[PDB]
Amino acid sequence: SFFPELYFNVDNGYLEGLVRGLKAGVLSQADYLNLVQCETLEDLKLHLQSTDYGNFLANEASPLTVSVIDDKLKEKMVVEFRHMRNHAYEPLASFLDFITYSYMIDNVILLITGTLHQRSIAELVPKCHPLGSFEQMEAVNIAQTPAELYNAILVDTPLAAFFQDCISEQDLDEMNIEIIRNTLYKAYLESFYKFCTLLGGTTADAMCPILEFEADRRAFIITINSFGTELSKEDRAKLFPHCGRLYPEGLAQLARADDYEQVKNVADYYPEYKLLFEGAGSNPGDKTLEDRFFEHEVKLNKLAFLNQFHFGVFYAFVKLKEQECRNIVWIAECIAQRHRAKIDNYIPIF
Amino acid sequence: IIETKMLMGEVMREAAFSLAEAKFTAGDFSTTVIQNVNKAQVKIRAKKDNVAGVTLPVFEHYHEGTDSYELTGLARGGEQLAKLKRNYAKAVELLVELA
Amino acid sequence: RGKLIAVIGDEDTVTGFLLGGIGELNKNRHPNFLVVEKDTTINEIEDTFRQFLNRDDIGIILINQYIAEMVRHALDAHQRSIPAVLEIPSKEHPYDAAKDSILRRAKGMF
């Protein structure tokens, strides 16, 4: 674009090359045919050792399990992301901090209600999802005091700014944990969108549409889901993110929605995701609606990869790598289950 | 006994399949659901049967009706979760019968 | 209405059943289940089974077949009707028909 190239390359050549190469570092489709063709866990180890992945089952349990496959995929992901985030710079470092803050709020909601209930905090440490870090103190050994964690997490933990909405220590008990997580997800997401818009380059250009898509899709799925729960339509509109094309129009019809057909009509207002609707076969041995959503994510990830002077390439690599781990562990799951009629719930990425 | 056992087998297989699909959907809801254990919505009622001069222990599947723990935060997997709420519930009923 | 179903199983079973609402914490904040994996030991399984036996509010036990294999002697020795112990096999592995505590009682059968 106008500002980058002369200034992008100087401090982004390494990371651009790294994301390109690590896109190339995913398992080839020939490797995938090796994966499906063994139908055994020992041979699964054998030929995953022979690809980019693998050679990581050393010092592990002789009875290879699917959970070990999940752990190794996630360890590869977190290793690659610690590699990328270790080398960064205030704009892009901040970008990757946003990329991580979603999992931060997830793990942080895992930590909360481990201390409102009388449970150990060392108990909580090994169960955190990777990337969690949490090397910051005042949140550990809190003596089971809600106010201690409240102040610990307003003061010390980096994402304290979003908890200005989650205050008063009353929501901890009177209100659901999940609804709190949803408010924080919304507030964080809109803050991230505003940060993206502040950086008004091709970063904004490539990140606006995908954030609008994420807001639109999450409003779509949540509206589908809550037809069997206790929630009113105004408290409903309260927690839909503002950063979406729906806020201009489409969110109102979702608020008016009460069943599958009104949300179908909402999808029909916009041809881009109507197509994602009619791919919701949900057949035993094929893909489902969520898989078509992930597929559209993959397409937008490729579109981000096409451009080269922005920062959505790394977010694209996030979503693709998550899909890839979902595929490999799922293949391991169906290998252990021995049910080959049902291996088809994974989306190859590259 | 054996007919109940075979129906048992196919039902549990189907239900734990729906569990695998939910794990694909929401990722790691296992941790939060094990985290959330305060009250149950189903109990067992011990009643008697005098099929003969002997007294026979027998059980019934009572439903207390306590609110279940709806989960929606993890990518809004509730569509898989309700499917599970049915698949495992049928299994539980058949368990009580078998016991 | 009287008693509380209890389950010991791997992560899959306990997750799926806590989804079904099978689970309770007593007034002492103690569960009616035990998540067991490669890190859980046989003696702990037997001790927790006896802990369940000590409780007067159980009725039913739900043992995964691996767990039953692990503590076979404890299960067989406990020839009591008060725990109506039911065997159930795991996800990824074949159904457990042999070594059933009741099929041995029958003789004119498969």
Swiss-Prot record, chain A:
Record PTM Phosphotyrosine, positions in chain: Y269
Kindly indicate where the leader peptide sits in this chain.
none
What GO molecular function annotation could you give as one example from this UniProt entry? protein-containing complex binding
The biological process GO terms on file are: cellular response to increased oxygen levels; cilium assembly; intracellular iron ion homeostasis; synaptic vesicle lumen acidification
Question: Where found, per UniProt?
Answer: Membrane; Lysosome membrane; Cytoplasmic vesicle, Clathrin-coated vesicle membrane
List the keywords (alphabetical): Cilium biogenesis/degradation, Cytoplasmic vesicle, Hydrogen ion transport, Ion transport, Lysosome, Membrane, Phosphoprotein, Transport
Its record classes its membrane topology as: Peripheral membrane protein
* Primary localisation category: membrane
Q: Using the record's annotations, give every residue carrying the modification Phosphoserine.
A: S282
| Tissue-wise expression | Ubiquitous.
Listed GO cellular component terms? apical plasma membrane; axon terminus; centrosome; clathrin-coated vesicle membrane; early endosome; lysosomal membrane; proton-transporting V-type ATPase complex; proton-transporting V-type ATPase, V0 domain
Family under the similarity heading: Belongs to the V-ATPase V0D/AC39 subunit family.
Its biological purpose is as follows: Subunit of the V0 complex of vacuolar(H+)-ATPase (V-ATPase), a multisubunit enzyme composed of a peripheral complex (V1) that hydrolyzes ATP and a membrane integral complex (V0) that translocates protons. V-ATPase is responsible for acidifying a variety of intracellular compartments in eukaryotic cells, thus providing most of the energy required for transport processes in the vacuolar system. May play a role in coupling of proton transport and ATP hydrolysis.
Protein name as it appears in the record: V-type proton ATPase subunit d 1
Question: Could you tell me which species this protein originates from?
Answer: Mus musculus (Mouse)
What does the organism's lineage look like at the top? Eukaryota, Metazoa, Chordata, Craniata, Vertebrata
From Swiss-Prot, chain B:
What name does UniProt use for this protein?
V-type proton ATPase subunit D
Supply the source organism's classification. Answer: Eukaryota, Metazoa, Chordata, Craniata, Vertebrata
User: What is the protein's known function?
Assistant: Subunit of the V1 complex of vacuolar(H+)-ATPase (V-ATPase), a multisubunit enzyme composed of a peripheral complex (V1) that hydrolyzes ATP and a membrane integral complex (V0) that translocates protons. V-ATPase is responsible for acidifying and maintaining the pH of intracellular compartments and in some cell types, is targeted to the plasma membrane, where it is responsible for acidifying the extracellular environment. May play a role in cilium biogenesis through regulation of the transport and the localization of proteins to the cilium.
* Subunit note: V-ATPase is a heteromultimeric enzyme made up of two complexes: the ATP-hydrolytic V1 complex and the proton translocation V0 complex. The V1 complex consists of three catalytic AB heterodimers that form a heterohexamer, three peripheral stalks each consisting of EG heterodimers, one central rotor including subunits D and F, and the regulatory subunits C and H. The proton translocation complex V0 consists of the proton transport subunit a, a ring of proteolipid subunits c9c'', rotary subunit d, subunits e and f, and the accessory subunits ATP6AP1/Ac45 and ATP6AP2/PRR. Interacts with SNX10.
Q: Coiled-coil intervals in this record?
A: none
Location of this chain's protein in the cell: Membrane; Cytoplasmic vesicle, Clathrin-coated vesicle membrane; Cytoplasm, Cytoskeleton, Microtubule organizing center, Centrosome; Cell projection, Cilium
Query: What is the name of the gene encoding this protein?
Result: Atp6v1d
User: Family per UniProt?
Assistant: Belongs to the V-ATPase D subunit family.
Swiss-Prot record, chain C:
Main subcellular location of this protein, as a coarse class = membrane
The protein, known as: V-type proton ATPase subunit F
Gene, per the UniProt record: Atp6v1f
Name its cellular compartments: Cytoplasmic vesicle, Secretory vesicle, Synaptic vesicle membrane; Cytoplasmic vesicle, Clathrin-coated vesicle membrane
- Keywords carried by this UniProt record: Cytoplasmic vesicle, Hydrogen ion transport, Ion transport, Membrane, Synapse, Transport
Membrane topology, as annotated: Peripheral membrane protein
A single Gene Ontology CC annotation of this entry is: synaptic vesicle membrane
Report the family membership: Belongs to the V-ATPase F subunit family.
What SUPFAM superfamilies does the annotation carry? AtpF-like
Function, as annotated: Subunit of the V1 complex of vacuolar(H+)-ATPase (V-ATPase), a multisubunit enzyme composed of a peripheral complex (V1) that hydrolyzes ATP and a membrane integral complex (V0) that translocates protons. V-ATPase is responsible for acidifying and maintaining the pH of intracellular compartments and in some cell types, is targeted to the plasma membrane, where it is responsible for acidifying the extracellular environment.
User: Which molecular function GO terms apply here?
Assistant: proton-transporting ATPase activity, rotational mechanism
Among the GO biological process terms of this entry, one is: synaptic vesicle lumen acidification
The secretion signal range is: none
Q: Organism, per UniProt? A: Mus musculus
Q: What is the lineage of its organism?
A: Eukaryota, Metazoa, Chordata, Craniata, Vertebrata
Task: Report quaternary structure and partners.
Answer: V-ATPase is a heteromultimeric enzyme made up of two complexes: the ATP-hydrolytic V1 complex and the proton translocation V0 complex. The V1 complex consists of three catalytic AB heterodimers that form a heterohexamer, three peripheral stalks each consisting of EG heterodimers, one central rotor including subunits D and F, and the regulatory subunits C and H. The proton translocation complex V0 consists of the proton transport subunit a, a ring of proteolipid subunits c9c'', rotary subunit d, subunits e and f, and the accessory subunits ATP6AP1/Ac45 and ATP6AP2/PRR.
The cross-references to InterPro entries, in alphabetical order and at most eight, read:
ATPase_V1-cplx_f_g_su (IPR008218), ATPase_V1-cplx_fsu_euk (IPR005772), ATPase_V1_fsu_sf (IPR036906)
